[PDB]
């Protein structure tokens, strides 16, 4: 009468031994026909945590994986940048990320049904978008996940108050600015590399190209800021050779580094004059209104497909002061050149001319269909089989998207059914358990299940030291055993072989052998765990001493096979799953006479 | 064998459709002759969050909010100017809220019960209470709750180290504050409202009129920070026109402008000379004894009853600055004016004895007793009846008050007693599902069961295609059963048919009509969830394929009336529940013997 | 049919009359033969929840307590004091403990499993280093719980990235830290006390001592921040009497003031001119070097034992400037003197000189191994008896150690089996339920138990008022009977049975006696927690009425002693159960028959 059954407590249900649970408890309700779909067999880890522990992208498509973290990257610089809107919750360093213990800020603008769950069993950035895609606006949810579009018309027409453009480019923004040998530069936008132990030569060309732009006033700060004049050294650049300044935008051959200098530096930096025809600019808006034009001329025809309302014109007026400081207007226009009026939105709209830069010189990013963003039609959720629904019910957090207040929320579905509004799309998060996905789990097992050929049960034999389990793979089993209930042994046993293959099937390490003093106690626990009662007894033989397990019922063939087939879809699949166990099954049957003799 | 049933998981116990639940669980141990206190049918939600979200103002009584947002305004202005007590923990802004996340300050003085529960299901604000009340002196939730003494003896002795005056005033400052066409200026304490873009014409004439009181120095600041320049030209008012500034104290028609100055914006901002019959002002604390004195003459006598300690005098004692600079002592007396020394704790009281200027000139709040807040007699709770005690301890969070250290604190009663402790009186917080409380969702269900009219079973017929719910309606029975379980079909059949009514009673839309390619789902739903086994089974029929939903036992009246008669009260009751679920019982019955024909 | 029997609800699970549910589950799996170890008996609970909220000082030892007390005060001063690493989260203050909200910060270094599980029912300082101990490198967390190595070989090999050293030292700075009577000084390395109202005199000479090496232009700045003059006429102190400052190195008497003030003052403070041999020392970094070189050349050759790759020389060079303001090469080298190049890192350094000053001058802490830290072997883990195993398993927190990246970190067990990798040691927590030690409960009801003598049940009679408990026990049993469930009698009644004694023990009041008319409630809940229907009905003698209250099976002696000896592990352990138990028994049988008659 050991304490092997417990009482429900909240710390056995958040353990991630208990997730396991999930795939022993959905797994054994699928018949091997079942089938999974493709785009939930990996699911959805905020790039964030993959990339500072990318143990788990064992979870994630190395395609999808790095199409997030392209446009993550492209998010972050968009909502840094941005004034407008807040939407980040994360502030991201050199090997490290915080997420950010920010207010919780309720406003007239959330969504009117109350999160109640906490998301307890994903990585710290995916429980951390969650609540925010819980109680915020869809389309915030959508940006910081870092959602690229499908191509096609199956996805969500999404609400909002307040709208970033929709920009798609292939690049690998985040993990340069979480690279661990990066600067952490006063820039949040960006972090330039660090190479033994200096500025990158890489980057640091750059920089010393950039600081064409700053004031004499400020360059110590930028100096010492990035340490250029030691990197200078360390990699052979004399940083007092650099080509004299270009700061007049009627002969600058590249206009690119006033473009970063404005972007990035000058939030911290003050700039250098900038000059049109020799005569000192006067606005900023306009020394960047002209740089990004002329410069980005060919993307201004692609500005209306993200920013509809924006200004073009074919004349643009300067604002200038000659050598009296006298104030000159300046009209400029050129055959076939259009201008544009950011309407004072200036680290935004930067940012993005240069974006779109980078989409025409680079690749585009291409995804399919993301079932946990942009999700599947309600009707098509609503259509679904009820196996196929209560499959995901378990195995992936559901949420509905609805309007209201002219804005698109998502919440638990359940919630917004319960709250009385009609969803318009279902999306899908898929859990993650020991860094492997629940429906990976559940999808491996069920198809090297009915890809398995058959045989009969293991023989009884003697000398059985191994479980066909390594030291580790063990330890898994039994220790997952103590999760067990009393119930008919038919569900038990089901439940049990099903772990058991499912731990086979990625423990590919040597068998582990059992020792005569404990062989009694993993007999205890296999044993118990199926339901089987399992005592102790002691026999004198002689002057020798016998310690005697006994198992009942015992557990040979006619009881496993027997009651696999009472709740086995077909008959046939109680085949495949006793041969898929077969290794395991070995040490089950032949240690159910047990006896261990003290001589 | 599909997944329908599971596994006890956190997610499951946290979503809203769970908290449903407890409405399910509740309502079937109670008989229809149980009475639901008036005091309980609506319940306590922080004002800071029905403000946000108002579609909760479904589970507030209309003239208690408003008593609430009144009183809490005014614990937010005194807390606000308070220095000696932080009991706030949250910062109000135009049309938001932020939950402060404040360090978890552990001291001396706090509860000596460890306090465990996190309180889940309620909106943020009301989570955010509850987990200072019991962690920290009662005396501080009640404040921060927006409380207000009934008018009466039955009331908690509070008590407490330090503490904040007893003002009981109806006003809107709450709603002023959070109206979200304010303008987020740099004093905490008021919310100037924005008309067209601009500051409103009835705060400007305020502002304009404060603006003579503060330093040529500062005046950009001032006028900067409320756009008042932009504003006085908006609405035709010529900014500069301003009657000459009233400064000296012996002629000063209006003393008003100089408190606001004094209490708001010398916050931020610094302040001009004040005079005593020409000569300066020479002690801040002096200008504001004087002013506040002169002003509230009236008021004076009442100060004794929150402040009992408090000098007043008939003599006070002016210094000021004659043209030399000299330092003059001036004493000023007058037949029955009384004077009063603040002892330097100047912002607070200067919100006092404005609070009571207005408590004198509005009406008084007037409020029943607050369940959630004075509560009962622990007397009282313990001499209550079983199935009331266990009602409240289900559907109620439930808390004691009970003394430590000369100070009262607030914990769930449970812990005071494992804590061996004796309460002195226990509060109430009704929960909240869905948008309704669940004290209304029963209390509603139990009156309207009982007020209704009784028949018979409906028959069964042809060609039924509603549930006697609407889309939404449908959706939300259908996917609560998914909570079911095997027992007894006599206890899930009462469950189910309660649920079906409770949600009848709310969903007041039209049927929805049932399409034969689903029929089936929905009927394996909602008899597996009274505990009937559905099977499906095909038949030919000639050419033709019929797909027969075979439901043991099968439901008519005699299995419904018989089990609801067994679980019942009375006999009499039963036939109640039957009559309510009438426009629900004619599916469950006439789908019976449901077949699919396919032709 | 009232609401006795619950729904499994997230708050059901956490507050702590849950918690005594695990010493009611597990010690009725124990025989008295168990033994509980005696390391296991107290708990941890980090000694900034003990020295806030003393009453918790039940659940630890008084000796372990001190040593954890001395340990974290040093261990924090060197955190405080450090830069390369930062392993507190908690700012301490006056009477009072800050957790920080930190961001949440994740890194290329953390933990590679993921920690789903929140500690919800320990103290706010333990939730939040077990939740650091399973995020971070388990180093970390041992230095932040204040933990002393065992005087053996038996104890952990902690690998990281960077290290603090090896400190063991019994002191009270912990104590001093907190002590509510302090001022909030600037410096958050240590905290001056108050006595009346004023810098104790203690401190006080400390202060004005400090004070000599402190400049002109900000001593203001210092006596304002403490109030010195004020403390000096208060105590009888001239503080204008102070002896000349010692600012010269070879003939300063005493080095300990400028060492203090160098370590703590001069991070918010300048300092003042400081010369060796008449000529200003010109580096800081050296007059830091030289003065703790020269008072604690003794502790140098123990620097090597916690910092071993340190530079140690013989010749130290100083840098001077002369008064002509020449630079000056000093060159000091003494026979037998040894001097210690810092290498800049000097708050930090300064802080372990002069600990070990301390570690030479005051005793050294002796400590037995720590369960919750150092724990035991993973062999003797694995060794051990299941019995042993599943108790840990349950009143424990149990977690691993393990290696990854030539790094230690600390996890549940659970979750290190799960992510398969196999753990080195196994440390344990132990719960604390109400105050006590969820292992004290259930190893002092199974001593008492075991030690009682033995006697029959307790008679049928009149008038029994008391059920051997007080007021507050009756409360502590009653309140805890409603997480009852329907279950074999035969676990109920031993579960209720040992629930009754373990309340006794502890519960040293009064009986209290119950009144007529509750008497039935009483009754109803303790015989419905033992799994006794009761039923209430009523009788008509004459003109009287009688309230029967109808209990079956009834509860008399061979009830309880045949269901006793069926779950116990002897027949005679079920008679010391009982006869432990005989005061509560006398109720629970006198009024099986019981009848309320009105007249």
Redo the contacts between chains.
Sequence with gaps: ????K??????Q??????????VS??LP??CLDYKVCDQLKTTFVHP??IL??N?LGSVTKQDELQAAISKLGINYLIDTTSRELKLFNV?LNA????????????????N???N??????????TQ?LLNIRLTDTEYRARFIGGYIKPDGSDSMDVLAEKKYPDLNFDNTYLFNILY?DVINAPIKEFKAKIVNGVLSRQDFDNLIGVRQYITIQDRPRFDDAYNIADAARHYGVNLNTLPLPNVDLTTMPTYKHLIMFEQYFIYTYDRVDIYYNGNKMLFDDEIINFTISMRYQSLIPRLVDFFPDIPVNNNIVLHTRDPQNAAVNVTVALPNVQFVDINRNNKFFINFFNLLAKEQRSTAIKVTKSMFWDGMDYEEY??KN??DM??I??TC?VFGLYNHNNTTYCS????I??????PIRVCLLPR????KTVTNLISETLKSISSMTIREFPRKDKSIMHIGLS??GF??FF?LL?LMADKPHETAIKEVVMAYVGIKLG?KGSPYYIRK??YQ?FI??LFASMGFKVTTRRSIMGSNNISIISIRPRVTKQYIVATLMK?S?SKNEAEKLITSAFDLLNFMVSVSDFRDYQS
């Design positions: 009468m050991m304490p092997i417990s009482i429900v407590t909240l710390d249900l958040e353990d991630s031994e208990y997730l396991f649970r999930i408890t959905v309700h699928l964030f945590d500072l522990n143990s502030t090997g490290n990320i915080d997420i950010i213990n920010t207010p919780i800020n309720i406003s007239s603008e959330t009117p049904i109350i109640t769950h906490s998301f307890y069993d994903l990585p710290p950035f951390h661990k609503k259509s009820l196996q209560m499959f019910n378990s957090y638990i579905l359940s919630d059914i319960s709250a009385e509004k009609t993650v358990v020991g860094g030291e580790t330890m898994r220790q103590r423990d003093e404990s106690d205890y626990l709740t879809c």
